[model samples]
Target chain A: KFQARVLTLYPEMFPGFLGCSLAGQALKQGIWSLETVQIRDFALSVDDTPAGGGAGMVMRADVLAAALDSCPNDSPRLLMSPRGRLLNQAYARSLARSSGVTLVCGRFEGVDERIIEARELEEVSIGDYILSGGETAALVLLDAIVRLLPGKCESFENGLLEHPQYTRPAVFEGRGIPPVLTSGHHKAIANWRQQQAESLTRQRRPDLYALYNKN
Target chain B: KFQARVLTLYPEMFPGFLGCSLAGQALKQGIWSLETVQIRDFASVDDTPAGGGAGMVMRADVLAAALDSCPNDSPRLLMSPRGRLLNQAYARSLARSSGVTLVCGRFEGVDERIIEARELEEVSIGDYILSGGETAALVLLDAIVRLLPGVMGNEISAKCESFENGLLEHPQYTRPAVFEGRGIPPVLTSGHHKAIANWRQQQAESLTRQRRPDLYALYNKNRQ
Candidate 1:
């Protein structure tokens, strides 16, 4: 399977994100590759007028079809459109587990629906919010999933979600570590962590649990 | 009011999230400042073996208290312990408005409870199945809230968050202008701008739906 790649109208826009942190590390190590293609290159004219008439330019299926042509054929084509299905945790995990991701960052008003219909593209969304394109959001998925890969951080013990970490002078102006922690008993610390995650999720992102059964 | 600055052992570890596009912009613009106090500066011993009892070292309260001195009167404090309880929208907006945030990153057991009782601290959480929550939950809130300050997004249209973003925008395009010559707003790029002007005009026509029902209730803070 080919490495996860992105198709964008703009390729220069990615360095800042690609060069940073986890994703950067993965890229530098050759664990993952984010490929970008200028969708406009595939278009028929300086712009595609459209099936009927409009000011906006719609991505041409021929070009998109050609871009898809370069794929191994086994890879699922994805059209990141508003009508795409909702994305969730399981899906995020799936993209990571699979051979690689190929994201179509939709630009302009979107592309010919036929491309998706014929290509059997998997339309996905990061969340309810809309992005100018799917590249960055797709990168976010890449980083989150990539970091979870085995070799990257295998040496660390229980790299679950980040654990509560207190550095240096344990005490801040006065906010010291919870006394419960000092007990040094594994059970208590484990209990505290469990309680924290549940409570925080309820408060910050209740939907994280309500919509999906995390257990 | 004193600013709620963070005093942590890992100053760089403050999620640096406040520096995300929106929050980082607001911070550089001088709307907010999260001066960091290194937790180590307060470390009581010249050398206390971390994890000495075993592996990780017990962070002492004295160090935390000293780090906190950076903030005047040391405003209301909070601990970023896992399972402490936290929410995104509420905490973020609050930080932006107040310009206050103090996050503690902890590992291993800390000097038990001395400083916790010393300060009125808020604990946050973000998971359910986990046996316990950790510093990440606290920090996630810190980074998220740093963006909410009114200082960010100097644009009034940004206010769409509660107003327009509640549902998101309709399909919009640039250059293709005059699809049928019906026209978008000449004012959008006309540069003859006013606060919330063309926005008011287009906003009247922009699509607004699929909003979170809960946010909708809050959006109605005032009745016509």
Candidate 2:
């Protein structure tokens, strides 16, 4: 079974939003599992002082080390930090293929830099923004992988699809369903959807457009 | 006060993780405020045709209902992977604004009308996908919240942070100065402010060049 081990100060937050929708169903089916290791449980204090002159505290390396020791060695270890490698579609796909991942949710100013080096933990950034802590970031990373796991949703597996849906109540005041969608011509519908994806990606995200071009 | 308005199907999710840490402290101090608009509360104006896809698309009318009643004129943003990348520049711009309204997507996605009509700017947190926009909403809010005046109480640190000047932040050293015999660099303790600033600048440039070549390239372009 695919499993995710989260080490954090807030253990109750696991599977928060992940506990609902597609991810929730997958967990119930036992296709995947989530477990948390409280970093505070393993630490002597909530945080330790920086070796140098700095304003905020850094998580002690030794305390985090003890927490790390309880985790399985097979899975990749990730520290959700600002300076880590950016998390993206390719990274999510890579993790979905793994047995699972062990994510360390950092708190305070940051974690002691020494343990990050000693543990060989790969730092992963969800975006360029700073978060209050790594718990939410951990959720983002987990949700990306969990939703991609097979047997949950079909379109999700298809990737970048489901052209702007429209159904009953199809006409909203003046806006109506595109005539092409209602034409009942399968070929036309297929062509229209393809163009929609292409156009949408182009207009909304040229970066994704370039990626799509290469793919 | 820095304000964040979130329009989402999941109202219970706000202040979920954002309710803790520095952001939480600032929240109580009234440095910022958070309120959610339930997209579901606005009747179902549309649905996903059978066999059409994995999830339903939020109707334009429903979103329109929510947007029309929205109190502030803050910038409206839709969190989607298929949207403009949210970076430090965007976050800073948001903090400078009076407030922001974020629409979290559920199901397949939201209809294009509401997006176009309301000019709901679509913003993406990263290149990865998530279960819902609720998660992205928190990320965006946190990103802006940390920068709001009086939030972190360390404006200088934020000024020196990564992405501010297009270079990644320098490595941070803490107490214990020496761990396993790997001591803190002497420059930090030298008490020579100019030398310290030089060291940090070099470290930031060096790290950015090594890890984020794309950003480093941007830095070089702007430098010229």
Candidate 3:
């Protein structure tokens, strides 16, 4: 079973949204397990004023090290931060295949650099923007990885942006479903969807379109 | 005051992590407000893919009904991978506005027509996809909420942090002059403020150039 241990200031936030959806159902079935270690539990004070005259506090290296040491596992140690390597589909898949993972949620201005080096915690960022803390970032990371785990049912695309999707109400607000979709001709539908996907990718995401063309 | 209303199949997920930490404290102070509309309440919200695909797609009519019920002038946004990338500037812009209505799509995605009919602006957090847009909504809200007045204790830090200046933040070090033989870079404690600022600026430039050349390129262009 895939094991996920989260070291955070807010333990209640773990499995918050992960506890409600398909990820939740998978958790109940024991496909994967979750454990939360309160970083505060292992320290008197988990953060202190930045040493270099900064505006916000930095999580103390020693205190965070103690919390990390308490867990003692081979799971990859990840520190969610905005400056780290951006997470992507391939990275999520690699993590999903790992034995498990230990995530450290940083708060305040940032985590101390010494602890990051000493603990060998790999920093991962969800996006370019900052969040209140690593807790929400951790949730997003877990949601991405969990869906890729063995039992969950979902989908993704190679490089092209996904073809626009349409469902019931063949015509809504006078906008009718694409004619090819309802023709009962599987080959034509597939062709039309692929073309639409390609066109959309080219128009909205030339970056992705370039990659798609290269392949 | 900032007002955010989320339309999602999982309305219970709103204010999950946002209900705690700095954002939570701000919530209690009425710096902002959160309201969630259940998309499922609009009835038969999803159906088999119109083009015979793998999973379900959110129906245009159902989602339209859910969105119309909100009856607000807020900018409508759909959380999607094929959308404008969310950055500090975008969050800052939203923070400066009255509020936003976020549409979180479940299953494969929402019918493309609803997006056009409602003039929904799609926004993406990052390159990776997730279980649903609800997580993305939470992330977007977190970014915007922290920028709200009184939400952050040290608003000065916000001005200097990553993206705000087109460069990532320099590494931070806190107390304990030495830890397991790791000492503070002498200049930080040397009391030479000018040298310290230069060192931090150089570090930020180097880090961004190494890890994010895309941002580095933009930073260079802007400087020129």
Candidate 4:
């Protein structure tokens, strides 16, 4: 299905990570394909500090342009950046609907703003968390995106239970699993799910709920 | 009483995070220690950046010297960066026992070479997932460190869960009267600890079996 491809300086690092797991199996089965290209392979170096004095040792733009030239232009380009819009479920769903997704991984402070400005790139963030490397962000993003793929989850539910997870302790120490889980009650199950999702979201994703309610 | 003192360029950034939690209580009670270093005060030029550098710069040589001059010589002087070695329980325990930690927060970018040559600092890496851009790596390190005290009260199956387990964790539950009119398993509420333990174990097995069959297969294979 030509799912997605990410372009970065460290192409070799993808295997055992994106290449493993359910996502990896999906790729091999032609459900999706991921091709990684080095950003350095397409950048140019400049000596003159330039007008804005530039940010750190950015992989030159002229070089990146060439890298993009080699990548399939059919898929829309997205740059993984801290300055970029965060990767939320909505964004992942949007990509899942698309035929192909291309992500550009940036490192060392970040890629030059001028290149993104000139290319009119859509910057995608994995979230607000600043990671040590872009690859880890890619790992998280890839996992999320893969989960959205058709037939990926063992059950069709695919992380639907935001709450209602019971870990050990049919009656741990003194606590117990809610009997409702085994009671076989549909109405009760729906109520339980709604309460759990709301409570879990409140605890884990207050920001998402805030924006969701506002909209 | 002396656990460690940490000096951050952004002192205001901590305390609220470090306080009011297990760490806060620990520090107040004299089990652990912390000291935030306001790096800007050490700057020679009121403005630390290089005339027209890209971002807010560190004071460099002085910052390194200040960290070195810190009264208690730490077993390790370190910086947290993308490329640094990541935090694990071992590192946290090591630091907790060693006592004293000095961290230099890089606003734009700390002078990389100087940090290495002068402070002899090692950077800590965080794959960085979770809430709040500001509280990523340090929060994770703090999470590991707090476990030293009996707050969680055990080595906890948490670390051994998911990534550490090489498989995702089965669901967990706690004392609940009844959720949504659902009843608790009669066995669970029973006084029999052995039966409760066995049921939890079986559920963990089946949960893994149903959700992550691959991991379930591994678990079973290992048992054999």
Interface RMSD for all numbered candidates: 10.3, 3.2, 1.8, 29.3
For every model in order, the TM-score on chain A comes to: 0.73, 0.81, 0.89, 0.77
Off by over 4 Å in 4: A43-55, A152-161, A167-169, A180-204, A209-215, B1-224
Sliding window of 10 residues with minimal summed lDDT for model 2 chain A: A152-161
At residue B76, give the lDDT of candidate 2.
92
Query: Lowest-lDDT window of 10 residues in candidate 4 chain B?
Result: B126-135
State which candidate, 1 or 2, has the greater DockQ: 2
Q: TM-score of candidate 2's chain B against its reference?
A: 0.85
Candidate 1 whole-model C-alpha lDDT, 0 to 1: 0.47
Q: Per-residue lDDT for B1-224 in model 3, tens only? A: 88999998888887998998778889999999999999888887789888677678889988888889978679999999877778877888898788899999777667999999999998888778788999999999999898886665646554544655668889899878899999889888889899999998898999889988877877888888
Residue-level lDDT tens digits of model 3 in A135-194:
988998899888888883212346677788888888898999989888999999889988
Across all candidates, what is each one's fraction of true contacts kept?
Answer: 0.05, 0.51, 0.86, 0.00
Structural similarity to truth (TM-score) of each candidate = 0.51, 0.85, 0.93, 0.45
Candidate 3 lDDT: 0.85
Task: lDDT winner between 3 and 4, please give it.
Answer: 3
Give the best candidate by lDDT.
3
| Pairs in clash, predicted candidate 3 | none
The CAPRI quality class of candidate 1 comes to: incorrect
Model 4 global lDDT (CA atoms, 0 to 1): 0.50
DockQ of 2: 0.47
Model 2 TM-score relative to the real fold: 0.85
**Global lDDT of each candidate:** 0.47, 0.78, 0.85, 0.50
